Structures are given as structure tokens and as C-alpha cells.
Amino acid sequence: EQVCDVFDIYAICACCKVESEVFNNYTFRGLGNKGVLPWKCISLDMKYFRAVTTYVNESKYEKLKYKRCKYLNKETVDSKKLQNVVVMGRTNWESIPKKFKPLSNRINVILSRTLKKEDFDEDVYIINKVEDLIVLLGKLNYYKCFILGGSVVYQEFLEKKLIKKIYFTRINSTYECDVFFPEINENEYQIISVSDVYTSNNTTLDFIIYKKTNNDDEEEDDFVYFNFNKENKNSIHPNDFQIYNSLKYKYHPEYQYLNIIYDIMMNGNKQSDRTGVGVLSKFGYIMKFDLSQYFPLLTTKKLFLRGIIEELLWFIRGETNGNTLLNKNVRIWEANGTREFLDNRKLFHREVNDLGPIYGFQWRHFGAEYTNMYDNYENKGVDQLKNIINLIKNDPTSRRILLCAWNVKDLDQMALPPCHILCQFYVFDGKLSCIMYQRSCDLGLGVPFNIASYSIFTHMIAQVCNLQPAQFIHVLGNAHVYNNHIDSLKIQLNRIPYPFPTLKLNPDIKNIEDFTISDFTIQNYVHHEKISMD
Amino acid sequence: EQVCDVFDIYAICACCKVESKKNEVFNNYTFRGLGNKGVLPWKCISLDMKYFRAVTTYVNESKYEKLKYKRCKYLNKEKKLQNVVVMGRTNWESIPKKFKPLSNRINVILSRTLKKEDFDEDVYIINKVEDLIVLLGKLNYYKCFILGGSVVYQEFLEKKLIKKIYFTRINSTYECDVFFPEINENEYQIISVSDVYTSNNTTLDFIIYKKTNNDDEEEDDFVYFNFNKENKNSIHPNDFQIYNSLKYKYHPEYQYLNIIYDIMMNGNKQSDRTGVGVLSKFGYIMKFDLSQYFPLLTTKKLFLRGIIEELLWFIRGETNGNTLLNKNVRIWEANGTREFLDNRKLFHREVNDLGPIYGFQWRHFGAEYTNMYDNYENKGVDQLKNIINLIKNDPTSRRILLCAWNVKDLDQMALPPCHILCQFYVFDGKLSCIMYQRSCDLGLGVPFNIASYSIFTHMIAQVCNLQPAQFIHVLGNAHVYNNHIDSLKIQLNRIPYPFPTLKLNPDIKNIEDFTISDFTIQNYVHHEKISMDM
Ligand SMILES: NC(=O)C1=CN([C@@H]2O[C@H](COP(=O)(O)OP(=O)(O)OC[C@H]3O[C@@H](n4cnc5c(N)ncnc54)[C@H](OP(=O)(O)O)[C@@H]3O)[C@@H](O)[C@H]2O)C=CC1
Ligand SMILES: NC(=O)C1=CN([C@@H]2O[C@H](COP(=O)(O)OP(=O)(O)OC[C@H]3O[C@@H](n4cnc5c(N)ncnc54)[C@H](OP(=O)(O)O)[C@@H]3O)[C@@H](O)[C@H]2O)C=CC1
Ligand SMILES: Nc1nc(N)c(-c2cccc(Cl)c2)c(CCCOc2cccc(OCCCC(=O)O)c2)n1
Ligand SMILES: Nc1nc(N)c(-c2cccc(Cl)c2)c(CCCOc2cccc(OCCCC(=O)O)c2)n1
Ligand SMILES: O=c1ccn([C@H]2C[C@H](O)[C@@H](COP(=O)(O)O)O2)c(=O)[nH]1
């Protein structure tokens, strides 16, 4: 029987990153700068705040007032339009512009030793000490009580264990800050929910929920009848996914990746393969990432992008020469170019690192006769890359905007047939979406890079066609987890994503061929520590 | 109040189709066969036995106290909870001794000719319906299920003592002499429709008719995370009245109907290559379990002769439109005309010479197309033969793909393929297929495309000694033509019937050996033909 649970006392805050790297929850702790917010205006966190702190459910008040009376050993509490209490520090209250006060449809309280009621109303309550809030809540009709802080207010409320939940906005950008939110003891509080990732006012943010740790139903039976035929399949335990299965709302788009790992681990088919390692496999998944709101670089481990950007630039040049990448210490294709690998593909007459008519060649020269990686292929075969950029510019409603790497004629001449079969483009209202069909998906190692590659490419094609990127849609055919990744992915699934980074391109690049490694910036990448998947 | 609502009195039945048909009309009354010669019309449908036992035995203890109050209040009152089951005397006498009385249920028999002295078993005898109501008032029980006789169903419906009918549609024909009463669409309407299943060589589903009226903390968190919830298009509510009245839409035909709904409500208005304009969206997945049913749409009439002739023409490697015209199959007639070929700039193409389309790419990818009469034997890649060989000899291959999108040949085709590729998956003796469709006409094309690739999956599985599992349909540019909207509004307010089954001649062992007479669609129950156009 606890005071926070009786009077439904919650903290709501927005924390940015702080100018001074290992990341943790404490990375997000910036509250204020010189008695104001560290940031200009984040209009989406403003709207979330207003909606959370003003929302009330009438039909739920009976149970709340009952509990409050029952616990105070009273039979009654004492307009009749139910509202929330909002508590502020003095410095916080005096931060707020005058006409923005008092906060609308909320009972405004102000912790202060040096204000006094008789220069405000009794609409706008005041209290000298913390215990004077519990007293005032005891005498009030209110839905819930929200601590809107000040670093001081939050500090004393958390250490006195008077907070049931923290509504915590992660502002994923760095500002000058002089006051910080206190370090949330992850023994005292734990995250039970994570929102979608959003862009507002040139930053990404998400909304998480910390919870104090515990140290017609005619149609409800019809649901049970429809499940009468429903079915550990693979030797995977519950305790394994404790944090993953503890979350209620898992709306962060990184869960589209994590949920597929979970599904293959729980329900996947045990299969041998080419590699001789064994996999769990399933067939047919879709993920969708909103490139207008974030860059979906996985945050539950560290990912590097230089190599995958160089690979894409090498595709766009129409190159097949593995040495070009090796000379820049990009080793993605090294194992596919060895004497031994090519001899096993029966490419006995192929030079080492001559990968044959792979992506680059099919994108710029589909149907040209491959000779060797040094030949001049200029104006030979179909320049599909040019054709799709022309169709996007000149016939945006075409349903034929496809870039295909799967050249059936040339497959046996490639060091290996492409995993990334095709990209299809869709244009609507100045916006570009991309579907990539992937025949073979290594969920542990390859798929995180593959999402980054095709997200970057969707931004590159958008910018050179004067469009804004919309959705990257990733279609997985044979989707597999290598048995040697299972322990590593167990670790990864029990990590809570961070708000995603943003991709910035040099805005001066207007032709697909003009991009260089320096034209790409990842911003505000906050990530858990690197995992070796093997 | 109402007697059926107080005492929670339900009917549960299983109805087959009855022997009376080239033009036969279908309605809910198609499923009416109950019994034959005092027993069931069929041998054993084990999945319906399972459903029957789960529905008539399920109780929810925590829900009982509320029902006790309801029944106490109506009457003016103060081991495990069980349901009551009521049967007719003839029904009772049909059950074998070893299954009588029905286990974990309170058994009740209606009889005039027999009294309790005539029964050894723990059963209540009642000689009047009125006495059932008295008995229910005197028992502790969860729900009351009327198990039939036709005589029993007839009188309980007549008296409006039925709150809901749990109705199994057995999609096969048998000799019957007793029939379920014709249901009045004004008294009872369908509220829920299950998945489709196969059991003992028949398809079936489970529908629910309803009597027409002729921590709750994370609940707030759910609203908080929903604070940013904004329908584009001028579609009216009442236009989807039946569609939106259903509680559970689990019939797999709703995968199709729900995509139509989504495009009508959220689709992007766009011109197209055609001039009609569309509503469009990008990226959907449907999954059809071919082990349980053949997914031939039931919300309108479809014939398969043409699409089977088209598939056999594809497999032969043919590009000659005249071959289909001579079988009165006009699917490709418009794309082979002088005008169409000239508008494609194929001035040097004979009428109905469709160029290197599907059949040619499947049997001869990379061969130079000449004309539709040439002998292309051993020219180009026989992909079809290679994928059959991979399925048989290397089943865990992630390279089992059939690709029609030959970038080099697109401009020589009457038109570029909509169905880009088929990828195959093999696990535990079963064959699954993904088809990726770049361009999907939801109103006219997609219904046929589902049937086409579902048949092809069955053909490939049989010639490789596998059982078909899933057909997975991935939609890229998915569009509804403006001229189809009013016909699709009608279609979406139709309730699917249990699906038919497809049988193949099991003597066919090679992909090239199928003929039209090797295919039977059985038990196709469908709503009326719709002209999608005006
Ligand atoms: N990012 C976010 O979510 C939020 C940021 N902010 C920002 O944070 C800053 C405000 O933070 P901070 O400087 O810590 O100031 P606070 O708003 O926490 O104010 C603290 C003052 O409130 C009173 N107080 C605190 N505890 C008690 C107590 N136990 N009994 C009586 N009075 C008490 C005292 O005022 P006195 O004794 O003088 O009367 C104390 O000096 C600003 O920059 C503001 O814009 C504020 C809220 C949320
Ligand atoms: N597919 C399905 O879901 C079902 C199929 N069946 C099949 O139905 C057939 C049996 O149906 P049907 O022939 O209609 O017989 P019923 O099972 O409806 O029983 C009829 C008998 O029950 C008694 N009865 C009915 N109403 C009353 C009443 N109001 N008061 C007193 N007694 C009453 C009478 O018994 P008495 O003669 O002793 O007075 C009457 O002759 C069988 O073929 C059985 O297999 C049955 C149920 C479900
Ligand atoms: N999730 C979350 N939790 C929170 N506690 C707060 C917050 C931050 C500072 C003050 C207050 Cl009352 C609330 C917010 C920021 C959005 C709401 O911010 C407001 C609302 C009303 C007035 C206001 O002051 C405007 C100017 C202040 C300045 O110049 O810095 C700020 N989000
Ligand atoms: N959905 C649905 N609703 C229903 N009312 C019934 C039904 C059908 C006949 C009798 C009875 Cl008690 C129930 C069923 C058929 C499956 C249940 O089948 C049973 C269960 C227990 C006994 C039994 O008796 C065999 C009848 C005579 C024969 O063997 O032909 C049949 N499904
Ligand atoms: O960009 C790539 C390249 C490879 N792979 C993985 C998928 C398979 O594990 C393997 C490709 O080999 P096959 O599927 O063809 O055997 O590498 C990816 O996920 N992405």
C-alpha cells in the first residue's frame, strides 16, 4: 500500500544529450539551460506533454477516489469536471511565460518555500514541503498527478520513492545544459514501453515509459473458440528473453527486425545448408522503415557504414573489380574472390577478385558480354540505373521502375548470384519509396547492413530526382538465423533500442554518379556496445 | 430482458450441402444438411468434433459471478463449473453408449415418449421447452448449448430462445433427410467467420450468427502512444456496412478484401499508363495455406479454364497468342493486335506474336528471340527445368528462383511481365512459393493471379514428390482502378464461403505432361458473377 500507487504520482520529462563514446539511458539527461529549455521548440514533445498531462478517464475515477478514501479512512474526498494535478518547482513555474499560466485544464500546484497563496488564487495551489502535496491530493478530486519537474523537484520525488512511472521523452540531439535529470536506478525503475521514432524540429526523438519495479465479452469467448486449433519447438527458453518479453508496447521500428529474429528462434525450421553450420529458417517477411522520420541503423549493437557506402559507390560505377574495395580495406567481397572460392564455383579461368557480372555490371550493362573486370563496357548493355532515374524524373507513376541484378543468363559467371534480387520504386506527392526483394537473408550479420545499404540508396535516388524519401520496404524470402548467432542474438533481443540516427547527404550532389565517401554523414547515432555474432 | 440473454442459450450445429447444377445459385441455405437415417450425413469430420467439444466444454470461472447476478436479478433471488447441453431424444439415441452422457457437461434430453426411469445415465429429462427454462433457473452452469435434432433447432429458433448460432459449414455434399431451419437474415446475422480448414477430405469453416436487435493502467499508456493519430478518400461509412459489422474476419479471403479496403480508404490518387487513374499503395503480402484450401475467391464467380490453359502455354515455352485464341482464351488477345504491337513500336512483329514473354524466359532466358514459330530447343537457360532439379536435388538452396524480368528483352515483349519472380522453399517434404508482382490490378487481375500461382505451386510440388504448403503473394504497386470502385464496394459487403479444393491427376510426374483434364476444382461455392466495369 504505497503513496505513489494511491495518489497515482508520475514524472513526465524530456531529456536531450549534453555537450562534453559509451551510451546508456543516462546519455539522455539534459533538462535545462539558464532557467529555460536547452532547445528552441520541439513541437511533437509539446503535443505529447499536453496530451498526457491533460488526458482523463471519467469512468475510471470511481476506483481511484475509492482507493484514496479507503486508504485515508474517510468515506468522501471532502465544478465536478475531472482533471489532473501538475506539480512544478518555483524556478520551473517562473520559467513559463505568464499567458501560458496557469496550465489549462490542469490543477496547477507549485512547490516553493518563498511563494505564498495570497498573491495567486486557491485555483493555483502552493505547498512549502513535499508531504504538503500528499495532504492536498487527499482533499482533491483529480485523475492523476504529474511532476513536471525542475531537476530539484524530480531528484527529491525519486529518492523519496513517490513516482510510480516516468514518461521520459528521449530528444536525440546535444545541447548546452546546466541542469540534468537524475540517474534512474535500473534496480528501482525499468522501461516497460518504447514508442515509434519521430522527427520534429530537426531532431529524432522517442517516448519511453519507466515503471517502478515490484521488489461485450460475448465476443471475448468467441475469440477463444476461434483459437481451438492453436499450437518449445526449438530448444529456446523463456528466461532467455526476459527483458524482450517484459515490454508491453514495442513500437520502436527496430522491433520489426528483433521480432523477426524472435519469430525464427521460436518457430523457425531447423535446416542444413551450403555453409554446413545449420540455420533456423522461415520464408516471407516484410519490414517497412519511414525514412522521413529516421535512418534505421540498428541501435541494439554497433554498426559501421564506410564499407557499405564504398560498396554502393562501386556498384554505381558499375565495377566488378574486388581489388578496388580491398585497396580501401573494404573486405565484404574478399572471401568471394579467392582462387579457392572461384575454383569451387568452376570459374577456373577467372582472375582472383574478378567477381564477374555481379550488381555493378547488371545495373550499368545488363545483357553485355562479360570478358574481364578491366574491359571497357562503355555504352554496352542496358544502363538500368540511368533508365530508372529517367523514369522517376519523367514518368513517376510508372509501375515499371525496377532495377534487377538477377540476370539468369549470367548467374553461373558471377562469384555468387545476388542476394538483393531487385529494387522497385514508387513516387507519390514528391516522395520516393523503394521495395528491395532479398532471396537470402542472414538475419544476424547481413540484414542489419542490408537495411542501411538500401536506405542510403533510397536517399541517393530521392536527392538526385528532387524527391523526398518516404518508405524503404524490405521483403525477405529465405530468412535464416545461423546456429552460431543464437547466443549473440539472445543478448541483442534483451537490449532496448535508442532513438535512431539521421542520414545527411551533401545537398550539392545532383547526379547519382557524383557521390563520394565524404558526401555522407550519420548524425546522433546512439547505440549499444558491439556484438561479435559468432 | 430476454430469456436467451439471461440463461445464455446458444445453438451449435454442423451443416453440409444436400443432393438436389451447372448454373447453381449459392446462399447461406446451401449449408443445411444435418442428418441422414437418424445419424450424421458424413463418416467423421474430426476437426468439427474438436471445435464442438472445445465450444460446449469451455467455461470462464471469473466470468460466472456476473452471470449468477444477472439470473438472480431476473428471477428475484439472492466441483468445476460446467455448461448445460440440450439434445432431442432422437439425437441422444444416435450417440454411442461410450460417449454418453457428454463428458464435463450437464446433459439434458427433451422427450415425451421416455421418462427418467428409461435412462441409466446422469441426465435430466424434460418433456417441455418451458421446463428447460425452470431447470436453468435451478442450476449453476456457464452457458447452455442446444445440440439439435432438427425438431429441437426448429422450435428453439421459432421461440427466439437462441442468442447465437455456432454454425459449421461442411463444404461437401451428402445424402441428408433432416435439415437445419432456413435462418431469417432479419432475426440473425453473421458476426464472425473463421479460417478455412481441411479435415477428412473436406474443407470447412466456423461462422457465428448473432440475434439482430430487430491493471487497466497500460490502457492509458496505449492512448498516450496514440497521441499522433492524424482517411484520405471520399468513401462513405454505410458503403461498408456488412464488411465493418463483422467482429472476427479470419477467412483468408479477408487478406484480399482487407487490401481492397485499405487502398479505398488510404490509397493515393494517381494517373496511370491507362488514363482511368487509380488509387494505389506500395507493398503488401498475402499468405494462403494450400494444405488447407484452394484460394479461389468466393465473393465473386471466377472460372479457371483460361488461366490453366495460360499456365500450360507458359510451361510449353510458347509465345504464339493464336494457340490460346484457338482454345477461346482471350487473356492475351488485346496485347497481340496490330495496333497494340505498333504502339509498342514492334512494327516488324506478326499479330499475336507476343515476343519473349513468360514462356520464352521460363524455357529459354538469354536466347535471341526471332519469331513465335522458331525452334528454340537447347537455346538459352531452361530455368523451369533448373528449379525442378534444385527442388529435387538441393532442397535447402536459397537460389530456387524463376525470373520473367529479362531486362535485355523487355522492349521486345508485347508488355513487361507483372509477375517478376517465383522463389521456392522446401522444409519437411513440403513446398512453399513466393511470387513478387510489380503491378497488381486488385479488382480484375489479382483474383486470377492468386489462383494461377496456387495451381503452379501444386504442379511443381507434385512433380517433385512434395506436398504444397504456402503460396505467398507479394504486391508492389497495388492499385484499384477508379472504374472498379462501385463493383468492389458491393464485393466487400459479401461474406466469403469456405474455399474449394484443387485435385491434380496423380499420374502426372513431369511438369511438361499436364493437360486441361488433369485439373479439378471441387466444392466451389461462390457469390454471383460481378462485372468490375460499369
Ligand atoms: N526538460 C524538462 O522536462 C524540464 C525542464 N525544466 C527546466 O529545468 C530548469 C528548472 O529546474 P531547477 O533549476 O532544478 O528548478 P526547479 O524548477 O526544480 O525549482 C526548485 C525550487 O522549487 C522549490 N522546491 C524544491 N523542493 C522543495 C521542497 N521540498 N519544498 C519546498 N520547495 C521546494 C524551491 O523554490 P523556493 O524555495 O525558491 O521557493 C526550489 O529552489 C529550467 O531550465 C526549466 O526550463 C523544468 C521542467 C521539466
Ligand atoms: N449436424 C448436426 O449438427 C446435428 C445433426 N443431428 C442429427 O439430426 C437427426 C436427429 O434429428 P430430429 O430427427 O429432428 O430429432 P431431434 O434430435 O430433434 O429429436 C426429436 C425428439 O425430441 C423430443 N422433443 C423435441 N422437442 C420436444 C419438446 N418440445 N418437448 C418434448 N420432447 C421434445 C421428442 O422425443 P420423443 O419422441 O421421445 O417425444 C422428439 O421426437 C439425426 O440424423 C442426428 O444425427 C442432430 C443434432 C446436430
Ligand atoms: N515530456 C515533457 N515533459 C516536461 N516536463 C516538459 C516540460 C519542460 C519545461 C517546463 C514544463 Cl512545465 C514542462 C516538456 C516540454 C514540453 C512542455 O513544455 C512546456 C509547457 C508549457 C510551458 C513551457 O515553457 C515554455 C518556455 C520554457 C523555456 O523557455 O524553456 C514549456 N516535455
Ligand atoms: N458443430 C457441431 N455441432 C453439433 N451439434 C454436432 C452434433 C451432431 C450430432 C450430435 C451431437 Cl451431440 C452434436 C456436431 C458434430 C460433431 C459433434 O459430434 C458428436 C459429438 C458427440 C456425439 C456424437 O454422436 C454421433 C452421432 C451419430 C453418428 O455417429 O452419426 C457426435 N458439430
Ligand atoms: O548482402 C548480403 C549478402 C549475403 N547475405 C547472406 C545470406 C546468406 O546467408 C548468404 C548468401 O549465400 P546463399 O544464400 O546464396 O547460399 O549470405 C546477406 O544477408 N546479405
Ligand SMILES: O=c1ccn([C@H]2C[C@H](O)[C@@H](COP(=O)(O)O)O2)c(=O)[nH]1
Ligand atoms: O497477370 C497480370 C497482368 C496484368 N495485371 C495488371 C496490373 C496493371 O494494372 C496492368 C499492367 O500495367 P503496367 O503496370 O505494365 O503499366 O495489368 C495484373 O494484375 N496481373
